[PDB]
Amino acid sequence: HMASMKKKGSVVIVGRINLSGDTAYAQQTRGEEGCQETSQTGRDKNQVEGEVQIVSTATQTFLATSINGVLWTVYHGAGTRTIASPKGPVTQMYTNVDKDLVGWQAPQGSRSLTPCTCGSSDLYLVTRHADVIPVRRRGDSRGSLLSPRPISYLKGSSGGPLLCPAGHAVGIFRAAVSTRGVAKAVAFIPVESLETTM
Ligand SMILES: COc1ccc2nc(C)c(O[C@@H]3C[C@H]4C(=O)N[C@]5(C(=O)NS(=O)(=O)C6(C)CC6)C[C@H]5/C=C\CCCCC[C@H](NC(=O)OC5CC(F)(F)C5)C(=O)N4C3)nc2c1
Ligand SMILES: [Zn+2]
């Protein structure tokens, strides 16, 4: 009934991948209970830092990456959901189901990656466990893992970045190609497709 119709909660930042030093490591900034409440209210007063955020809904967790002032992630994770912020839910600035892409204004305190113009094919995928995985670029939107591994290790890292040797953003991870559960390749939204969307 119209009186009982519910609304989906906001995407909530629950942590980040720390890339500031010599060692990449995941940090949690909010536990599951506070995540649930923040998803319902859409208010998040937690300080945001860094480039790669770990984000969660009521039912899914995944990554979001700031590039050029936009926090980017995948539609198959976020749908059309708002993101929680200090002053309430923030509506998406970009939505493209055809690219599996959404974006919101980058949160206050985040740092953005610079879009890559190197034209290099030696990439690095950053996962939600702060693994830095070498990937050889194989096309506009595909790359092969130098060391294949079970897809389990990539699950939950959609929205994470592929970076060039210089640390620029080359793309946003969206899907894994596997054979008998072993990830051999990845698909990503290229930064140029983001830059067009911008
Ligand atoms: C509904 O509207 C939309 C619109 C456009 C969409 N567009 C895509 C491509 C898509 O694909 C879904 C979700 C995504 C995924 O699982 N993303 C990862 C992930 O981690 N998600 S996640 O964070 O855990 C989660 C679900 C958010 C919480 C990163 C990968 C890690 C492990 C894979 C597990 C097995 C799955 C292997 C599979 N592979 C594949 O589809 O291969 C082919 C696509 C191709 F490349 F062309 C070949 C795969 O990867 N996906 C399946 N749904 C869309 C939905
Ligand atoms: Zn570069």
Side-chain angles (χ1 to χ4, degrees), residues 2-5 8-31 34-35 38-39 41-44 46 48-86 88-110 112-141 143-179 181-183 185-198:
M2 281 273 108
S4 47
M5 285 304 270
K8 284 185 173 173
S10 295
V11 176
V12 177
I13 291 166
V14 295
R16 77 183 66 98
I17 308 303
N18 196 300
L19 304 170
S20 75
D22 59 326
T23 303
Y25 62 103
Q27 307 172 279
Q28 193 178 258
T29 55
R30 204 188 269 288
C35 180
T38 304
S39 188
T41 70
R43 282 84 169 93
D44 178 5
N46 276 10
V48 168
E49 302 188 59
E51 307 95 342
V52 184
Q53 313 296 323
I54 310 166
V55 297
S56 179
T57 62
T59 58
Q60 297 196 109
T61 185
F62 63 90
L63 297 176
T65 303
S66 288
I67 306 168
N68 203 25
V70 176
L71 184 74
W72 300 99
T73 193
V74 294
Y75 187 92
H76 79 260
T80 56
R81 288 183 196 244
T82 53
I83 193 165
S85 87
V90 171
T91 293
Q92 281 175 24
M93 167 177 297
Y94 303 100
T95 311
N96 192 326
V97 68
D98 290 324
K99 298 179 177 173
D100 195 16
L101 178 71
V102 301
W104 304 271
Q105 55 208 252
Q108 290 297 294
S110 63
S112 294
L113 299 163
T114 303
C116 183
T117 63
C118 296
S120 168
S121 288
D122 291 332
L123 316 182
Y124 301 90
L125 170 69
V126 180
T127 75
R128 74 178 288 115
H129 308 297
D131 293 322
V132 179
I133 294 180
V135 172
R136 173 70 182 186
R137 193 175 191 167
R138 297 294 189 190
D140 52 354
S141 61
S144 57
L145 272 67
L146 295 203
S147 306
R149 64 204 75 191
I151 49 170
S152 306
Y153 289 100
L154 305 183
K155 182 179 187 294
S157 292
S158 71
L162 284 76
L163 307 168
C164 78
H168 312 135
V170 174
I172 296 294
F173 183 30
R174 69 185 181 181
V177 182
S178 57
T179 295
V182 171
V186 292
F188 58 87
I189 300 91
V191 74
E192 290 95 347
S193 182
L194 305 183
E195 277 168 305
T196 285
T197 295
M198 297 200 250

PDB file of all heavy atoms in Angstrom, residues 137-158, unseen atoms left out:
ATOM      1  N   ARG A 137      46.986  -4.366 -19.223  1.00  0.00           N
ATOM      2  CA  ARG A 137      45.851  -3.888 -20.002  1.00  0.00           C
ATOM      3  C   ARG A 137      45.784  -4.649 -21.323  1.00  0.00           C
ATOM      4  O   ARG A 137      46.798  -4.821 -22.005  1.00  0.00           O
ATOM      5  CB  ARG A 137      45.950  -2.385 -20.253  1.00  0.00           C
ATOM      6  CG  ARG A 137      44.636  -1.803 -20.786  1.00  0.00           C
ATOM      7  CD  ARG A 137      44.656  -0.290 -20.926  1.00  0.00           C
ATOM      8  NE  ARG A 137      43.303   0.206 -21.172  1.00  0.00           N
ATOM      9  CZ  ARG A 137      42.934   1.480 -21.093  1.00  0.00           C
ATOM     10  NH1 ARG A 137      43.819   2.419 -20.780  1.00  0.00           N
ATOM     11  NH2 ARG A 137      41.673   1.817 -21.340  1.00  0.00           N
ATOM     12  N   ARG A 138      44.587  -5.122 -21.675  1.00  0.00           N
ATOM     13  CA  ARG A 138      44.391  -5.938 -22.868  1.00  0.00           C
ATOM     14  C   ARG A 138      43.399  -5.328 -23.849  1.00  0.00           C
ATOM     15  O   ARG A 138      43.215  -5.870 -24.947  1.00  0.00           O
ATOM     16  CB  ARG A 138      43.917  -7.342 -22.474  1.00  0.00           C
ATOM     17  CG  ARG A 138      44.918  -8.120 -21.631  1.00  0.00           C
ATOM     18  CD  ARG A 138      46.187  -8.438 -22.421  1.00  0.00           C
ATOM     19  NE  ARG A 138      47.059  -9.368 -21.705  1.00  0.00           N
ATOM     20  CZ  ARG A 138      48.304  -9.664 -22.067  1.00  0.00           C
ATOM     21  NH1 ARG A 138      48.838  -9.101 -23.144  1.00  0.00           N
ATOM     22  NH2 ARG A 138      49.018 -10.523 -21.348  1.00  0.00           N
ATOM     23  N   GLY A 139      42.768  -4.221 -23.486  1.00  0.00           N
ATOM     24  CA  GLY A 139      41.806  -3.567 -24.346  1.00  0.00           C
ATOM     25  C   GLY A 139      41.369  -2.264 -23.717  1.00  0.00           C
ATOM     26  O   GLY A 139      41.896  -1.847 -22.685  1.00  0.00           O
ATOM     27  N   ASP A 140      40.382  -1.620 -24.343  1.00  0.00           N
ATOM     28  CA  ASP A 140      39.870  -0.376 -23.776  1.00  0.00           C
ATOM     29  C   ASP A 140      39.319  -0.598 -22.370  1.00  0.00           C
ATOM     30  O   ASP A 140      39.454   0.268 -21.496  1.00  0.00           O
ATOM     31  CB  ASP A 140      38.806   0.236 -24.694  1.00  0.00           C
ATOM     32  CG  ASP A 140      37.702  -0.746 -25.079  1.00  0.00           C
ATOM     33  OD1 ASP A 140      37.789  -1.941 -24.741  1.00  0.00           O
ATOM     34  OD2 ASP A 140      36.736  -0.305 -25.737  1.00  0.00           O
ATOM     35  N   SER A 141      38.729  -1.766 -22.118  1.00  0.00           N
ATOM     36  CA  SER A 141      38.039  -2.005 -20.854  1.00  0.00           C
ATOM     37  C   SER A 141      38.357  -3.359 -20.234  1.00  0.00           C
ATOM     38  O   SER A 141      37.577  -3.846 -19.404  1.00  0.00           O
ATOM     39  CB  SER A 141      36.530  -1.878 -21.059  1.00  0.00           C
ATOM     40  OG  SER A 141      36.107  -2.849 -22.007  1.00  0.00           O
ATOM     41  N   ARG A 142      39.485  -3.969 -20.591  1.00  0.00           N
ATOM     42  CA  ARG A 142      39.838  -5.279 -20.068  1.00  0.00           C
ATOM     43  C   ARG A 142      41.325  -5.339 -19.752  1.00  0.00           C
ATOM     44  O   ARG A 142      42.139  -4.660 -20.381  1.00  0.00           O
ATOM     45  CB  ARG A 142      39.476  -6.395 -21.060  1.00  0.00           C
ATOM     46  N   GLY A 143      41.660  -6.158 -18.763  1.00  0.00           N
ATOM     47  CA  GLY A 143      43.046  -6.438 -18.428  1.00  0.00           C
ATOM     48  C   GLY A 143      43.153  -7.831 -17.852  1.00  0.00           C
ATOM     49  O   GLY A 143      42.190  -8.363 -17.291  1.00  0.00           O
ATOM     50  N   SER A 144      44.327  -8.437 -18.007  1.00  0.00           N
ATOM     51  CA  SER A 144      44.570  -9.785 -17.513  1.00  0.00           C
ATOM     52  C   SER A 144      45.386  -9.732 -16.229  1.00  0.00           C
ATOM     53  O   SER A 144      46.310  -8.924 -16.102  1.00  0.00           O
ATOM     54  CB  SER A 144      45.293 -10.632 -18.566  1.00  0.00           C
ATOM     55  OG  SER A 144      46.518 -10.042 -18.963  1.00  0.00           O
ATOM     56  N   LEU A 145      45.031 -10.586 -15.268  1.00  0.00           N
ATOM     57  CA  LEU A 145      45.812 -10.691 -14.042  1.00  0.00           C
ATOM     58  C   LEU A 145      47.141 -11.373 -14.337  1.00  0.00           C
ATOM     59  O   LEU A 145      47.180 -12.405 -15.013  1.00  0.00           O
ATOM     60  CB  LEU A 145      45.058 -11.486 -12.979  1.00  0.00           C
ATOM     61  CG  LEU A 145      44.098 -10.758 -12.041  1.00  0.00           C
ATOM     62  CD1 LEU A 145      42.927 -10.237 -12.842  1.00  0.00           C
ATOM     63  CD2 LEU A 145      43.621 -11.683 -10.931  1.00  0.00           C
ATOM     64  N   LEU A 146      48.233 -10.807 -13.822  1.00  0.00           N
ATOM     65  CA  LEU A 146      49.525 -11.463 -13.991  1.00  0.00           C
ATOM     66  C   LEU A 146      49.592 -12.750 -13.176  1.00  0.00           C
ATOM     67  O   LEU A 146      50.253 -13.710 -13.585  1.00  0.00           O
ATOM     68  CB  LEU A 146      50.657 -10.516 -13.597  1.00  0.00           C
ATOM     69  CG  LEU A 146      50.844  -9.251 -14.447  1.00  0.00           C
ATOM     70  CD1 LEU A 146      52.273  -8.724 -14.319  1.00  0.00           C
ATOM     71  CD2 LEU A 146      50.481  -9.475 -15.907  1.00  0.00           C
ATOM     72  N   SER A 147      48.914 -12.786 -12.033  1.00  0.00           N
ATOM     73  CA  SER A 147      48.787 -13.992 -11.217  1.00  0.00           C
ATOM     74  C   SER A 147      47.305 -14.249 -10.990  1.00  0.00           C
ATOM     75  O   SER A 147      46.707 -13.658 -10.074  1.00  0.00           O
ATOM     76  CB  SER A 147      49.525 -13.847  -9.893  1.00  0.00           C
ATOM     77  OG  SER A 147      50.877 -13.475 -10.121  1.00  0.00           O
ATOM     78  N   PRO A 148      46.678 -15.097 -11.806  1.00  0.00           N
ATOM     79  CA  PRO A 148      45.271 -15.444 -11.572  1.00  0.00           C
ATOM     80  C   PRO A 148      45.050 -15.929 -10.146  1.00  0.00           C
ATOM     81  O   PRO A 148      45.966 -16.426  -9.489  1.00  0.00           O
ATOM     82  CB  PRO A 148      45.004 -16.559 -12.590  1.00  0.00           C
ATOM     83  CG  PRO A 148      46.012 -16.331 -13.681  1.00  0.00           C
ATOM     84  CD  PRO A 148      47.225 -15.736 -13.019  1.00  0.00           C
ATOM     85  N   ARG A 149      43.819 -15.785  -9.671  1.00  0.00           N
ATOM     86  CA  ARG A 149      43.450 -16.294  -8.359  1.00  0.00           C
ATOM     87  C   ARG A 149      41.939 -16.434  -8.304  1.00  0.00           C
ATOM     88  O   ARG A 149      41.227 -15.857  -9.136  1.00  0.00           O
ATOM     89  CB  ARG A 149      43.948 -15.371  -7.236  1.00  0.00           C
ATOM     90  CG  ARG A 149      43.333 -13.991  -7.252  1.00  0.00           C
ATOM     91  CD  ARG A 149      44.237 -12.999  -6.552  1.00  0.00           C
ATOM     92  NE  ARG A 149      45.383 -12.649  -7.382  1.00  0.00           N
ATOM     93  CZ  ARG A 149      46.442 -11.972  -6.951  1.00  0.00           C
ATOM     94  NH1 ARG A 149      46.509 -11.575  -5.689  1.00  0.00           N
ATOM     95  NH2 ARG A 149      47.436 -11.698  -7.784  1.00  0.00           N
ATOM     96  N   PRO A 150      41.421 -17.193  -7.341  1.00  0.00           N
ATOM     97  CA  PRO A 150      39.972 -17.433  -7.289  1.00  0.00           C
ATOM     98  C   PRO A 150      39.201 -16.124  -7.214  1.00  0.00           C
ATOM     99  O   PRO A 150      39.643 -15.151  -6.600  1.00  0.00           O
ATOM    100  CB  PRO A 150      39.795 -18.264  -6.012  1.00  0.00           C
ATOM    101  CG  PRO A 150      41.129 -18.961  -5.833  1.00  0.00           C
ATOM    102  CD  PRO A 150      42.156 -17.939  -6.301  1.00  0.00           C
ATOM    103  N   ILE A 151      38.028 -16.108  -7.852  1.00  0.00           N
ATOM    104  CA  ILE A 151      37.225 -14.890  -7.887  1.00  0.00           C
ATOM    105  C   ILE A 151      36.862 -14.433  -6.483  1.00  0.00           C
ATOM    106  O   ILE A 151      36.582 -13.247  -6.270  1.00  0.00           O
ATOM    107  CB  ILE A 151      35.951 -15.090  -8.733  1.00  0.00           C
ATOM    108  CG1 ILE A 151      35.221 -16.373  -8.326  1.00  0.00           C
ATOM    109  CG2 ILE A 151      36.290 -15.097 -10.218  1.00  0.00           C
ATOM    110  CD1 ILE A 151      33.841 -16.507  -8.938  1.00  0.00           C
ATOM    111  N   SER A 152      36.859 -15.352  -5.513  1.00  0.00           N
ATOM    112  CA  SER A 152      36.584 -14.986  -4.127  1.00  0.00           C
ATOM    113  C   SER A 152      37.423 -13.795  -3.686  1.00  0.00           C
ATOM    114  O   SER A 152      36.962 -12.953  -2.906  1.00  0.00           O
ATOM    115  CB  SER A 152      36.862 -16.181  -3.209  1.00  0.00           C
ATOM    116  OG  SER A 152      36.150 -17.330  -3.632  1.00  0.00           O
ATOM    117  N   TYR A 153      38.668 -13.716  -4.160  1.00  0.00           N
ATOM    118  CA  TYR A 153      39.571 -12.658  -3.727  1.00  0.00           C
ATOM    119  C   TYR A 153      39.240 -11.307  -4.344  1.00  0.00           C
ATOM    120  O   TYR A 153      39.688 -10.279  -3.824  1.00  0.00           O
ATOM    121  CB  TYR A 153      41.016 -13.035  -4.062  1.00  0.00           C
ATOM    122  CG  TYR A 153      41.548 -14.158  -3.204  1.00  0.00           C
ATOM    123  CD1 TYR A 153      41.603 -15.458  -3.686  1.00  0.00           C
ATOM    124  CD2 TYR A 153      41.978 -13.920  -1.907  1.00  0.00           C
ATOM    125  CE1 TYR A 153      42.083 -16.490  -2.902  1.00  0.00           C
ATOM    126  CE2 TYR A 153      42.459 -14.945  -1.115  1.00  0.00           C
ATOM    127  CZ  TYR A 153      42.508 -16.227  -1.616  1.00  0.00           C
ATOM    128  OH  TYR A 153      42.985 -17.251  -0.830  1.00  0.00           O
ATOM    129  N   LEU A 154      38.471 -11.286  -5.430  1.00  0.00           N
ATOM    130  CA  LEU A 154      38.043 -10.040  -6.050  1.00  0.00           C
ATOM    131  C   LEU A 154      36.637  -9.619  -5.647  1.00  0.00           C
ATOM    132  O   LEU A 154      36.278  -8.452  -5.845  1.00  0.00           O
ATOM    133  CB  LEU A 154      38.099 -10.160  -7.577  1.00  0.00           C
ATOM    134  CG  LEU A 154      39.442 -10.585  -8.162  1.00  0.00           C
ATOM    135  CD1 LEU A 154      39.421 -10.605  -9.671  1.00  0.00           C
ATOM    136  CD2 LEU A 154      40.531  -9.649  -7.655  1.00  0.00           C
ATOM    137  N   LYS A 155      35.833 -10.534  -5.105  1.00  0.00           N
ATOM    138  CA  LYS A 155      34.461 -10.204  -4.746  1.00  0.00           C
ATOM    139  C   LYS A 155      34.454  -9.047  -3.756  1.00  0.00           C
ATOM    140  O   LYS A 155      35.216  -9.037  -2.784  1.00  0.00           O
ATOM    141  CB  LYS A 155      33.757 -11.424  -4.146  1.00  0.00           C
ATOM    142  CG  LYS A 155      32.296 -11.195  -3.784  1.00  0.00           C
ATOM    143  CD  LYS A 155      31.668 -12.468  -3.213  1.00  0.00           C
ATOM    144  CE  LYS A 155      30.158 -12.335  -3.001  1.00  0.00           C
ATOM    145  NZ  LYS A 155      29.795 -11.343  -1.954  1.00  0.00           N
ATOM    146  N   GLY A 156      33.596  -8.069  -4.013  1.00  0.00           N
ATOM    147  CA  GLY A 156      33.492  -6.902  -3.163  1.00  0.00           C
ATOM    148  C   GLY A 156      34.447  -5.777  -3.482  1.00  0.00           C
ATOM    149  O   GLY A 156      34.482  -4.788  -2.740  1.00  0.00           O
ATOM    150  N   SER A 157      35.219  -5.887  -4.557  1.00  0.00           N
ATOM    151  CA  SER A 157      36.138  -4.832  -4.951  1.00  0.00           C
ATOM    152  C   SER A 157      35.673  -4.052  -6.173  1.00  0.00           C
ATOM    153  O   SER A 157      36.397  -3.159  -6.624  1.00  0.00           O
ATOM    154  CB  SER A 157      37.535  -5.415  -5.201  1.00  0.00           C
ATOM    155  OG  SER A 157      38.098  -5.876  -3.986  1.00  0.00           O
ATOM    156  N   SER A 158      34.492  -4.347  -6.719  1.00  0.00           N
ATOM    157  CA  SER A 158      33.948  -3.484  -7.760  1.00  0.00           C
ATOM    158  C   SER A 158      33.870  -2.056  -7.229  1.00  0.00           C
ATOM    159  O   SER A 158      33.620  -1.829  -6.041  1.00  0.00           O
ATOM    160  CB  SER A 158      32.569  -3.967  -8.214  1.00  0.00           C
ATOM    161  OG  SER A 158      31.576  -3.756  -7.232  1.00  0.00           O
TER     162      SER A 158
END
